[PDB]
Design a protein around this ligand. Structure first.
Ligand code: CLA
Ligand code: CLA
Ligand code: CLA
Ligand code: CLA
Ligand code: CLA
Ligand SMILES: CCCCCCCCCCCCCCCCCC(=O)OC[C@H](CO[C@@H]1O[C@H](CO)[C@H](O)[C@H](O)[C@H]1O)OC(=O)CCCCCCCCCCCCCCCCC
Ligand SMILES: CCCCCCCCCCCCCCCCCC(=O)OC[C@H](CO[C@@H]1O[C@H](CO)[C@H](O)[C@H](O)[C@H]1O)OC(=O)CCCCCCCCCCCCCCCCC
Ligand SMILES: CCCCCCCCCCCCCCCC(=O)OC[C@H](COP(=O)(O)OC[C@@H](O)CO)OC(=O)CCCCCCCCCCCCCCC
Ligand SMILES: CC1=C(/C=C/C(C)=C/C=C/C(C)=C/C=C/C=C(C)/C=C/C=C(C)/C=C/C2=C(C)CCCC2(C)C)C(C)(C)CCC1
Ligand SMILES: CC1=C(/C=C/C(C)=C/C=C/C(C)=C/C=C/C=C(C)/C=C/C=C(C)/C=C/C2=C(C)CCCC2(C)C)C(C)(C)CCC1
Ligand SMILES: CC1=C(/C=C/C(C)=C/C=C/C(C)=C/C=C/C=C(C)/C=C/C=C(C)/C=C/C2=C(C)CCCC2(C)C)C(C)(C)CCC1
Ligand SMILES: [Fe+2]
Ligand code: NA
Lengths: 484, 67, 27, 76, 38, 31, 48, 30, 348, 31, 36, 30, 31, 38, 30
C-alpha cells in the first residue's frame, strides 16, 4: 500500500479533510503557544529586570508576548519591574489560557470537518466533481490578509486602538510598549526605525486589499493557468513553501542582525554590538563626558548604569554558546547579582593598560594588557620562564570604579591575573552559581536559538519547495515514464 | 449522489463555483511581469539599504535610529 | 569630549570597534 | 552539424588557426610582459609591495572610504 | 463522493523498512546520546 | 559560423589561449 | 582521495538519480515505485 | 549510569544487525 | 493546449528556438545559467591568474604574484567591509574596476554569479527532464550541492562578521577554511558533520561496490574477452544477474539488495542526506553554535589531573591552532601576541 | 544532563520504535 | 574533410600540452614563487 | 536628495535593463 | 521523585499504549 | 508437523478493548502518580 | 511540574472518554 511518507496524501483530493487536518494543525500550534507560555511563566523569575532579564532565563515566547503589548502578569508583577494592580484579561497567563481555549475549539472544529467532509460546497456545480477554485480562494485569502495587516498596522501598533509595540532607546535602558507613529519617508525603510512597522503594515494591507479585489475579479489566463498548474493544490503548496522559507530567511536575518522589531531588552544583545564595541563605546563616551565636566573617576563610573555594564559583557553575546549547551544563560554562568565596577590597570611606571577583549570566535583567549598607543605591555604568559611581560615583572595593579569594589586597589599578582582574565570578557560581574548549579560555560541567547531554528527550517523548506514543485510539474510521470 | 447541504455551504457556494474558468490568451501576464519587476526593484532597494550598499539622507541604518 | 582620546582608548581593548573603523582614512 | 574529427582533420581549420591561436598566445604574453596586466588588475609588481611609509601588509579597515584608503595604501 | 470516504488508502511497512527504521533510530541515539548527556 | 556550438567553443577557447600565453609569460618573470 | 570520495558521492547520486528518473511505469501512485521491480525479472526496469 | 546507556545502545544496535541478517525477509525469486 | 485556438505570440517562437536540440541546449534556464556560470568560472580563473589579495588579506594569491594552482585563490574581501555586496558601482568601489579587484569585490562577483548559476543549472535539469519526460530526481539530488554552497559560502559568513570568514575560492584557501573550522569550531566533533562524512564515505562505497558488483555479475552475452562490446543500448533484458549479485552479497556481508529500484535510490539518498546534514551543521556554525566541548569531561579534567582522553588532546590542539593562526589569519584583529602567551609543548 | 538526557534518549528510542512496530505489525498481518 | 590524420593532430596537440606543463613546472623553480 | 549611492543604484538598474535587452537581442539574433 | 517519577509515569503510559495500539491497528487493518 | 508451524494464530483487539486498555492505563497513572511523585 | 503531569493525565483521561463516547465501534443489529 502507501509508503509511510505518503500517508498524508489521502487528503489531496478531499477539501473537507484538508480543512480538518489544517484545523488540527492550528489547534496543535495554538496549544503549543499556550503551554509554552504557561511553562515560561512557571519558570520565570521577574524580581530583577536589570541583571536577570527574560533573555537570561531562556524565555522564548515571553519576548514575543512583550513585543506587542502584553507586559503584565496575574502574579502582580510587570515586565518592566513595576507593580500591576489590574493586569486585566490580557496578561501573560490570559494569553496562554486564550490559546489553550482556542486550541480546544479548533480541535472540535477539526473533528466536525473530518466527519462532515462531503459538503456540496466542495462539489463543482458543472460536473459534480470535487474541486477548489484556487484563484478565487487566493483572492479571498489575500483580501482577508490585507484587511488584517492594515488593521494591525493602523490600530494596534499605532496605539490608535491597540497598545502599540515595544520601543526602546538605542542602548536598551528605558524601553516600554508605546504607540508608534508611521514613517512615510525614506526613514520608514530604516530597519531600526520603529515607525517603519506601522507604515509597512498600512501600505501593504492596502495593497493586499487591492490585489485581493483584483484576484476576486480577474480570472487567470489559460497560458499561466497551465504553466503554474493552478488546478493542482500541490502547486499552491510548492509556492507557499517557497514564500514561507523566504520569510523564514528574512526573520532569521532580522533577528540575527537586529532591528526595531527585535529589541535587545527582550531578545538580548546581538553579536555585532560586541564586535563593533557598541556598549563599550557608549560607556566610555559617558565616562569621558562628566570627566571633562569635572568629576573624578570614582564617580561618573558609579553614574554608569549596571544595565549598560551588563550589556557590555561577552557572556551576553548570542554567538558564544553551543549546540548542546542547553537552557538559560543563567544555567551557564550563574545569575548576575552585581556589577563589580570598571577595572583600570596600571603598571609600575603609571601608564594605563587595557585588557584585549576576547573576540567572538575564540573559545579561549590569551590575557594581554596593551597601553594607549597599541603596544603590548603585560600578559599572563604561557611560558613562565624567560618571559618579559608577566604581571609580576611589569608590576600591574588594578583599581575598580563604580561598582561593589569602588575605590579598592589590588596589587597582588594572583588577584590582578584573575581580574584581568575577567576583564577579558568585558565588564566584570559577580555571579550566583549555586542556585542553578551553573557549569561555568557560556550559553546562547533566545535570538541565537531563534536564528538557528529558523535558518535550519528555511533550508529544509527550500528542499520541500523543490520536492513539491517537482511533484507538481512532473505529476504525470510520478509513477514512471511512458515506456513509448 | 450529491453532497451534504448546509446553510453556510449554500452561502459560500458561489465563491467555489468557477473552478477551471480562465481567460483566453495571456491575459494580464504583462501587467503581472511589470508588478513583479517593480517588486524586485523594491526588494533590491531595501536589501541595499539594510546592507549599507544604498546610503540615504535620513536613513541611519543603525541602532541610533531608535533615538 | 576628546574623541581622539576615547578612540585611542577603545582601540587597544577592541580593534574592531566602529569608531576605529570609521573615518580612519584621515588617520 | 559537422563532426569535430571532420573539422580538426581539415586544412582550412589549420590555416585559420595557425594564425589565430598564436596571435592570442602572443597577445597574452604581451599583456603580461608590458605591465598592462598589473595596470588592469591592480596586483603589485614585486618591488612595490611595501613603501617607505609602511613596511607591513596593508589593512583596509574602512568601508565607506575604502576607495580612498586603497588608493593611499596602493603603489601610488 | 458517497457516505464512505473514497480516499481510503492502506499504509504498508515491510520488514526491510522496519530494520532500516530501527537502525536509523538506534544509530541516531548512539550518535547523539554523548552530546545530549554532555 | 556564429552558431551556438561555435560561440560556446570560442567563449572558452579564446580566453584559454590568451590566459595560457599570459601564464607562460609569467613563467619568465625574473622578479 | 578527496576527489575520489567527492566523485563517488557525485556519481552515486547521479547514477542513482538517473535510474530513478528513467524508471518504467509499472505501479500506481499509491504504491512504492520499488514495487515495479520484481526480484529476478528478466526485463530491464529503467530506460537506459 | 551513562555508561549503561551507551552500552545498551550499542548492544541494541548489534541486536538489530543480528536480526536484520538472520531474520530478514527472504528474497523471493517466485 | 487542449485543442484550443492557441494563437502564437513571441513567447512561442522564443520557446521553439530556446528548446531546440543543439550541441549545447540552452532552454529558458540557459539565459540564467550560461552567463552566470560563465562569469563565475571566468572570474575565478581571472582572479587566480591576475588579481591579488595583498590589500584584503596581506597575501599573494595569483599566478602573476608567483603562486601555483594550489596556492592561488580569489580571496574574500576585508572584514571591515562586513557583508557588503561589493558592487562595482557600490559605495566602496564606486565604479573603479581596478580598485574593485583590489578590494575583494571579485569574490562577491564570483560567489553571487555562481549561486545564480547553480540555480540556473538546477533549472536546466528541471527543463531538460520535462522536455524528455523523465522524473526530476537529478535536480532533487543536485539540491544538496546547492544546499552545501548556500550554507557554506553565504549563510556562514552572513552569520559571522563578514565575507572575510567565508571560504576563498582556491585550493589552499579551502584548506585554510577547513583548518579554521577545526581549530575554532571543533567541526569534526559535530554530529551533523559526522553524518555528512558518513554520507559521503557511504556514497563512495556504494559507487565502488555497485560498479564492481555489476561488472562482476555480468551475463556472457558475447564471445570476445572484452565484455564492454557485449552490451547494446536498445537491449531489453538485464546485463547482470541480480540474482547472483544478491546471493553473493547475502553470503558475504549478510544482507544484499533484492530490488534494483531501491538500490538506485539508496545510492541517490545517502550522499544527498549526508550533504544536507552537513549543511545544517554549517548553519549551526554560522552562529557559533558549535559542538565544541563535552562539559562533563571538561569538569572531570578540571577536577582530575590524571584524566586524559583523545577529546582533551584535540581541545589542546584546537587551542594551539587558534593561538598560532589568529595573528596572521585575522589581521583586522591586529593581534601582536608575544610568543610567551603562545601555548607550546616541551622542547619542540 | 544525567536524567533529562536519559528521558530524552528513552523517548527518542521508544516513540519512533512504537510507530515503526505499529506499521510493521499491521503490514505483516495484512500479508 | 579529411586531410591531416586525427592521430597526428592529437599527437602534436599533446606534445604542445606536455611542453606547456613542463614550462609551468620549470617556472616553479625559477622567477617568482621559486623560494630563491 | 539623491546621494551618489542612489545615483549609482539607478544607473545600475539602467545597466541591468540594458543587459537584459542585449541578451534578448542575442536570443533573437540566432 | 521529580524526574524519576516523571520517567516512570511516561514509560508506564507509552509502553502499554504502544502495545495496545499495535494490536488495535493490526486488528482494524483486518477490519 | 509440517515445514511451517501449524500453531499459527492471529491476535485480535477491537476498539472497545482498546478504549478499555487506554482507560485502564491512564486511570492507573492518575491513581498512582501522586504516590510515585510522593 | 507535577501539576503539569496531573493536569495532563486528567485531560488525557477525559480525551479517552470523549473518543470512547463519540468514536465508539457502532453496535450492529446483524
Ligand atoms: C523554533 C523552535 C524553538 C526555539 C528556537 C526554542 C528556543 C528555546 N527553548 Mg524551546 N521549545 C520548542 C521550540 C523552540 N524553542 C518547542 C517546540 C518545545 C516543545 C517540545 C520547546 C520546549 C522547551 C522547553 C521545555 C525548554 C525550552 C527552552 C529553550 C531555550 C533554551 C535553549 C534550547 O532550545 O535548548 C537547547 C536546544 C537544543 C539542544 C536543540 C537540539 C538540537 C537538535 C534538535 C538535535 C537533532 C535531533 C536529534 C536527532 C535528536 C536525537 C537525540 C536523542 C539521542 C536524545 C531556548 C530559548 C528551555 C528553557 O530555557 O526554558 C525556559 C527549556 O527547558 N523549550
Ligand atoms: C484571534 C487570534 C489570535 C491573536 C490575535 C493571537 C495573538 C498572539 N499570538 Mg497567536 N495564534 C493564533 C491566534 C491568535 N494569536 C492561532 C490561530 C495560532 C495557530 C496558528 C496561533 C499560534 C501562535 C504561536 C505559534 C505564537 C502565538 C503568539 C502570539 C502573540 C504574539 C503574536 C506575534 O508575535 O505575532 C507575530 C506574527 C507574525 C509575524 C505573522 C506575520 C504574518 C505573515 C508575515 C504573513 C505572510 C503571508 C501573507 C499572506 C502575506 C500578505 C501579503 C500582503 C500584501 C497583505 C499574541 C498574544 C506568539 C507567542 O508569544 O505566544 C506565546 C507565538 O509564539 N500565536
Ligand atoms: C508546510 C509544508 C509541508 C506540507 C503541507 C507537506 C505535505 C506533504 N509532503 Mg512534504 N516536505 C516539506 C513540507 C511540507 N510537506 C518539507 C519542509 C520537506 C523537506 C524536509 C518536504 C519533503 C517531502 C518529501 C520528500 C515527501 C513529502 C511528501 C508529502 C506528502 C505526504 C506527507 C506525509 O505523509 O508525511 C508522513 C510523515 C510521517 C508519517 C512522519 C514524519 C515525521 C518527521 C520526520 C519528524 C516529526 C515532525 C514533527 C512532529 C513536526 C515538527 C516540525 C515542524 C515544525 C515542521 C504531503 C502532500 C511526500 C509526497 O510528495 O508524497 C507523494 C514525499 O515523499 N514531503
Ligand atoms: C535553486 C533554486 C531554485 C530552483 C531551481 C527552483 C525550482 C522551482 N521553482 Mg523556485 N524559487 C526559489 C528557488 C528555486 N526554485 C526561491 C529562492 C524562490 C523565492 C522564495 C522561489 C520562488 C518560486 C515560486 C513562488 C514558485 C517557484 C516554482 C518553481 C518551479 C518552476 C520553475 C520556476 O518558476 O523557477 C523559478 C525561477 C527562478 C528561481 C529564477 C530566478 C532568477 C532571478 C530572477 C534572478 C534575479 C537576479 C537579480 C539580479 C537580483 C540579484 C540579487 C543580489 C543583488 C543579491 C521549480 C520546481 C514555481 C512553480 O511553478 O512551482 C510549481 C512557483 O510557483 N519558485
Ligand atoms: C543571467 C544574467 C545575470 C544575472 C542574473 C546577474 C546577476 C547579478 N549581477 Mg551581473 N552581469 C551579467 C549577467 C547577469 N548578472 C552581464 C551580462 C554582465 C556583463 C556586462 C554582468 C556584469 C556584472 C557586474 C560587473 C556586476 C554584476 C553584479 C550582479 C549582481 C547584482 C546586480 C544588481 O544589483 O543589479 C540588479 C539589476 C536589475 C535587477 C535590473 C533591473 C532593471 C529594471 C527591472 C528595468 C527598469 C530600469 C529602467 C530602464 C531604469 C547580481 C548577482 C555585481 C556583482 O556581482 O556584485 C559583486 C557587479 O558589480 N554583474
Ligand atoms: C529526543 C527528542 C528531542 C531532541 C532534543 C533533545 C534536547 C536535550 C535537552 O534536554 O534539552 C533541554 C533544554 C533545556 O535544558 C535545561 O533547561 C533548564 C532551563 O529550562 C536549565 O537551563 C538546564 O540547565 C538545562 O539543561 O531545552 C529544551 O527543552 C529543548 C527545547 C526544544 C527546542 C529546541 C530549540 C529548537 C531549535 C531548532 C529547531 C529545529 C530545527 C531543525 C533541526 C535542526
Ligand atoms: C536556496 C536557494 C537560493 C540560493 C541563492 C539565492 C541567490 C543569491 C543569494 C544572495 C544573498 C545576498 C545576501 C545579502 C544579505 C546581507 O548582506 O546581509 C547583511 C545585512 C546586514 O549587514 C550587517 O548588519 C549588522 C547589523 O548589526 C552589522 O552592521 C554587520 O556589520 C553588517 O554586515 O543584512 C541584509 O542586508 C539582509 C539580511 C536580511 C535578509 C536575510 C538574508 C538571508 C539570511 C541571513 C541570515 C543571517 C544570519
Ligand atoms: C593506477 C593503477 C590502475 C590499475 C588498474 C585498475 C583496474 C581495476 C580497478 C578495480 C576494478 C574493480 C572491479 C571492476 C571490474 O571487474 O572491471 C571491469 C573490467 C572488465 O572488463 P573485461 O573483462 O572486458 O577486460 C579485462 C580483461 O578481461 C581483458 O579485457 O575491467 C576492466 O575494464 C579492465 C581495465 C583495464 C584498463 C587498465 C588501465
Ligand atoms: C478539548 C477542548 C478543550 C480543551 C483543550 C486543551 C486542553 C487543549 C490543549 C493542548 C496542548 C497542551 C497542546 C500542546 C501541544 C504541544 C505541541 C503540539 C508540541 C510539540 C512538539 C514538537 C513538534 C517539537 C519537536 C522537536 C523536539 C521534540 C525537540 C527539538 C526539535 C523539535 C523542535 C523538532 C476546551 C475545554 C478548551 C474546549 C472544549 C474542547
Ligand atoms: C571577472 C569579470 C568579468 C568576467 C570576465 C570573464 C567571464 C572572463 C574570462 C575568462 C576565462 C574563461 C579565462 C580562462 C583561463 C583559462 C586557463 C587559465 C586555462 C587552463 C588550462 C590548463 C592550465 C591546463 C593544464 C593541463 C594540460 C595542458 C596537460 C594535462 C591536463 C591539464 C588539464 C593538467 C566581467 C568582464 C564580466 C566583469 C568584470 C569582472
Ligand atoms: C597518450 C595519448 C595520446 C598521445 C600523446 C603524446 C603527445 C604522445 C607522445 C609521445 C612521444 C613524444 C614519443 C616519442 C618517443 C621517442 C622514443 C621512444 C625514442 C627513442 C630512442 C632512443 C632509445 C635514443 C637513443 C639515443 C641515445 C640513448 C644516446 C644518444 C643518441 C640517441 C638519442 C639516438 C593521443 C592523443 C595520441 C591519444 C590519447 C592519449
Ligand atoms: Fe546501476
Ligand atoms: Na612537546
Amino acid at each position: 500500500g502507501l509508503p509511510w511518507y505518503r500517508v498524508h496524501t489521502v487528503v489531496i483530493n478531499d477539501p473537507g479533510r484538508l480543512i480538518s487536518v489544517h484545523l488540527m494543525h492550528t489547534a496543535l500550534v495554538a496549544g503549543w503557544a499556550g503551554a509554552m507560555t504557561l511553562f515560561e511563566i512557571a519558570v520565570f523569575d521577574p524580581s530583577d529586570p536589570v541583571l536577570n532579564p527574560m533573555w537570561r532565563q531562556g524565555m522564548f515566547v515571553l519576548p514575543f508576548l512583550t513585543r506587542l503589548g502584553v507586559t503584565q502578569s496575574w502574579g502582580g508583577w510587570t515586565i518592566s519591574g513595576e507593580t500591576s494592580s489590574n493586569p486585566g484579561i490580557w496578561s501573560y497567563e490570559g494569553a496562554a489560557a486564550s490559546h489553550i481555549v482556542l486550541s480546544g475549539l479548533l480541535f472540535l472544529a477539526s473533528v466536525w470537518h473530518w466527519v462532515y467532509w462531503d459538503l456540496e460546497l466542495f462539489r463543482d456545480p458543472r460536473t459534480g466533481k470535487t474541486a477548489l477554485d484556487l484563484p478565487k480562494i487566493f483572492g479571498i485569502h489575500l483580501f482577508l490578509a490585507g484587511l488584517l495587516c492594515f488593521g494591525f498596522g493602523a490600530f494596534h501598533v499605532t496605539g490608535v486602538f491597540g497598545p502599540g509595540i515595544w520601543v526602546s532607546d538605542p542602548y536598551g535602558l528605558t524601553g516600554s510598549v508605546q504607540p508608534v507613529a508611521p514613517s512615510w519617508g525614506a526613514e520608514g525603510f530604516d530597519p531600526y526605525n520603529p515607525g517603519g512597522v506601522p507604515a509597512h503594515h498600512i501600505a501593504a494591507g492596502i495593497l493586499g486589499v487591492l490585489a485581493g479585489l483584483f484576484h476576486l475579479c480577474v480570472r487567470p489566463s489559460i497560458r499561466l493557468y497551465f504553466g503554474l498548474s493552478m488546478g493542482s493544490i500541490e502547486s499552491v503548496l510548492s509556492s507557499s513553501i517557497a514564500a514561507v522559507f523566504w520569510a523564514a530567511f528574512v526573520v532569521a536575518g532580522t533577528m540575527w542582525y537586529g532591528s526595531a522589531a527585535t529589541p535587545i531588552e527582550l531578545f538580548g544583545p546581538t553579536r555585532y554590538q560586541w564586535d563593533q564595541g557598541f556598549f563599550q563605546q557608549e560607556i566610555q563616551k559617558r565616562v569621558a563626558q562628566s570627566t571633562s565636566e569635572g568629576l573624578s573617576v570614582s564617580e561618573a563610573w558609579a553614574k554608569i548604569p549596571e544595565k549598560l555594564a551588563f550589556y557590555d559583557y561577552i557572556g551576553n553575546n548570542p554567538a558564544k554558546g553551543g549546540l548542546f549547551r542547553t537552557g538559560a544563560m543563567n544555567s551557564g554562568d550563574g545569575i548576575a547579582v552585581g556589577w563589580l565596577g570598571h577595572a583600570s590597570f596600571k603598571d609600575q611606571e603609571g601608564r594605563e593598560l587595557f585588557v584585549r577583549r576576547m573576540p567572538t570566535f575564540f573559545e579561549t583567549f590569551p590575557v594581554v594588557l596593551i597601553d594607549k598607543d597599541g603596544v603590548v605591555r603585560a600578559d599572563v604568559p604561557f611560558r613562565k620562564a624567560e618571559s618579559k611581560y608577566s604581571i609580576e615583572q611589569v608590576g600591574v595593579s588594578v583599581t575598580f570604579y563604580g561598582g561593589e569594589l569602588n575605590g579598592l586597589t589590588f596589587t597582588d599578582p594572583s588577584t590582578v591575573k584573575k581580574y584581568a582574565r575577567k576583564a577579558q570578557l568585558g565588564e566584570i560581574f559577580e555571579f550566583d552559581r549555586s542556585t542553578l548549579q551553573s557549569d561555568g560555560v557560556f550559553r546562547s541567547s533566545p535570538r541565537g536559538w531563534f536564528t538557528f531554528g529558523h535558518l535550519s527550517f528555511a533550508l529544509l523548506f527550500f528542499f520541500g519547495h523543490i520536492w513539491h514543485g517537482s511533484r507538481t510539474i512532473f505529476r504525470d510521470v510520478f509513477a514512471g515514464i511512458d515506456e513509448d | 449522489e450529491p453532497g451534504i447541504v448546509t446553510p453556510l455551504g449554500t452561502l459560500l457556494r458561489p465563491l467555489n463555483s468557477e473552478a477551471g474558468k480562465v481567460l483566453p490568451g495571456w491575459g494580464t501576464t504583462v501587467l503581472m511581469a511589470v508588478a513583479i519587476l517593480l517588486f524586485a526593484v523594491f526588494l533590491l532597494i531595501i536589501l541595499e539599504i539594510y546592507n549599507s550598499s544604498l546610503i540615504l539622507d535620513g536613513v541611519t541604518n543603525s541602532w541610533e535610529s531608535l533615538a | 569630549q576628546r574623541v581622539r582620546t576615547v578612540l585611542d582608548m577603545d582601540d587597544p581593548a577592541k580593534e574592531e570597534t566602529v569608531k576605529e573603523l570609521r573615518k580612519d582614512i584621515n588617520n | 552539424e559537422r563532426p569535430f574529427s571532420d573539422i580538426l582533420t581539415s586544412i582550412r581549420y589549420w590555416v585559420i588557426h595557425s594564425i589565430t591561436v598564436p596571435s592570442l598566445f602572443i597577445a597574452g604574453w604581451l599583456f603580461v610582459s608590458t605591465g598592462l596586466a598589473y595596470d588592469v588588475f591592480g596586483s603589485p609588481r614585486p618591488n612595490e609591495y611595501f613603501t617607505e611609509d609602511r613596511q607591513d601588509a596593508p589593512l583596509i579597515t574602512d568601508r565607506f572610504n575604502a576607495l580612498e584608503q586603497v588608493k593611499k595604501l596602493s603603489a601610488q | 463522493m458517497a457516505r464512505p470516504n473514497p480516499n481510503k488508502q492502506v499504509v504498508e511497512l515491510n520488514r526491510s523498512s522496519l530494520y532500516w527504521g530501527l537502525l536509523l533510530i538506534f544509530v541516531l541515539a548512539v550518535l547523539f546520546s554523548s552530546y545530549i548527556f554532555n | 559560423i556564429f552558431t551556438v556550438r561555435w560561440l560556446a567553443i570560442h567563449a572558452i577557447a579564446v580566453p584559454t589561449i590568451f590566459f595560457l600565453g599570459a601564464i607562460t609569460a609569467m613563467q619568465f618573470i625574473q622578479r | 582521495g578527496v576527489a575520489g570520495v567527492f566523485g563517488g558521492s557525485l556519481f552515486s547520486a547521479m547514477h542513482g538519480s538517473l535510474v530513478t528518473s528513467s524508471l518504467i511505469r509499472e505501479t500506481t501512485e499509491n504504491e512504492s515505485a520499488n514495487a515495479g521491480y520484481k526480484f529476478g525479472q528478466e526485463e530491464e526496469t529503467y530506460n537506459i | 549510569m551513562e555508561a549503561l546507556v551507551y552500552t545498551f545502545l550499542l548492544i541494541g544496535t548489534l541486536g538489530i544487525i543480528f536480526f536484520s541478517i538472520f531474520f530478514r525477509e527472504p528474497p523471493r525469486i517466485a | 493546449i487542449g485543442t484550443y485556438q492557441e494563437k502564437r505570440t513571441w513567447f512561442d517562437d522564443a520557446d521553439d528556438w530556446l528548446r531546440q536540440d543543439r550541441f549545447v541546449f540552452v532552454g529558458w534556464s540557459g539565459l540564467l545559467l550560461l552567463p552566470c556560470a560563465y562569469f563565475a568560472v571566468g572570474g575565478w580563473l581571472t582572479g587566480c591568474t591576475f588579481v591579488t589579495s595583498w590589500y584584503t588579506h596581506g597575501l599573494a594569491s595569483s599566478y602573476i604574484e608567483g603562486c601555483n594552482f594550489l596556492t592561488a585563490a580569489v580571496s574574500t574581501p576585508a572584514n571591515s567591509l562586513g557583508h557588503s555586496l561589493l558592487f562595482v558601482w557600490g559605495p566602496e568601489a564606486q565604479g573603479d574596476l581596478t580598485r574593485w579587484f583590489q578590494l575583494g569585490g571579485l569574490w562577491a562577483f564570483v560567489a553571487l554569479h555562481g549561486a545564480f548559476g547553480l540555480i540556473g543549472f538546477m533549472l536546466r535539469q528541471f527543463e531538460i527532464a520535462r522536455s524528455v519526460n523523465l522524473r526530476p530526481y537529478n535536480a532533487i539530488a543536485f539540491s544538496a550541492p546547492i544546499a552545501v554552497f548556500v550554507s557554506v559560502f553565504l549563510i556562514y559568513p552572513l552569520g559571522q562578521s563578514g565575507w572575510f570568514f567565508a571560504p576563498s575560492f582556491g585550493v589552499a584557501s579551502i584548506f585554510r577554511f577547513i583548518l579554521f573550522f577545526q581549530g575554532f569550531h571543533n567541526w569534526t566533533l559535530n554530529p551533523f558533520h559526522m553524518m555528512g562524512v558518513a554520507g559521503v564515505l557511504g556514497a563512495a562505497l556504494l559507487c565502488a561496490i555497485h560498479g564492481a558488483t555489476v561488472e562482476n555479475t555480468l551475463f556472457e552475452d558475447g564471445d570476445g574477452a572484452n565484455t564492454f562490446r557485449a552490451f547494446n543500448p536498445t537491449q531489453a533484458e538485464e546485463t547482470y544477474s541480480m540474482v547472483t549479485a544478491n546471493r553473493f552479497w547475502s553470503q558475504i556481508f549478510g544482507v544484499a539488495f533484492s530490488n534494483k529500484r531501491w538500490l538506485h535510490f539508496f545510492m541517490l539518498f545517502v550522499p544527498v542526506t549526508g550533504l544536507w546534514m552537513s549543511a545544517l551543521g554549517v548553519v549551526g556554525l554560522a552562529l557559533n553554535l558549535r559542538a565544541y566541548d563535552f562539559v562533563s569531561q571538561e569538569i572531570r579534567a578540571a577536577e582530575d589531573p590524571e584524566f586524559e582522553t583523545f577529546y582533551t588532546k584535540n581541545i589542546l590542539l584546537n587551542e594551539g591552532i587558534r593561538a598560532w593562526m589568529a595573528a596572521q589569519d585575522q589581521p583586522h584583529e591586529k593581534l601582536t601576541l608575544p610568543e610567551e602567551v603562545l601555548p607550546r609543548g616541551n622542547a619542540l | 544532563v544525567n536524567i533529562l538526557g536519559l528521558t530524552a534518549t528513552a523517548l527518542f528510542i521508544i516513540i519512533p520504535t512504537s510507530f515503526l512496530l505499529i506499521l510493521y505489525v499491521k503490514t505483516a498481518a495484512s500479508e | 574533410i579529411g586531410r591531416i590524420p586525427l592521430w597526428l593532430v592529437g599527437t602534436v596537440v599533446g606534445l604542445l600540452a606536455i611542453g606547456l606543463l613542463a614550462i609551468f613546472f620549470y617556472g616553479s623553480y625559477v622567477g617568482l614563487g621559486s623560494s630563491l | 536628495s539623491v546621494t551618489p549611492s542612489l545615483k549609482n543604484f539607478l544607473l545600475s538598474l539602467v545597466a541591468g535593463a540594458v543587459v537584459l535587452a542585449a541578451i534578448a537581442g542575442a536570443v533573437t539574433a540566432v
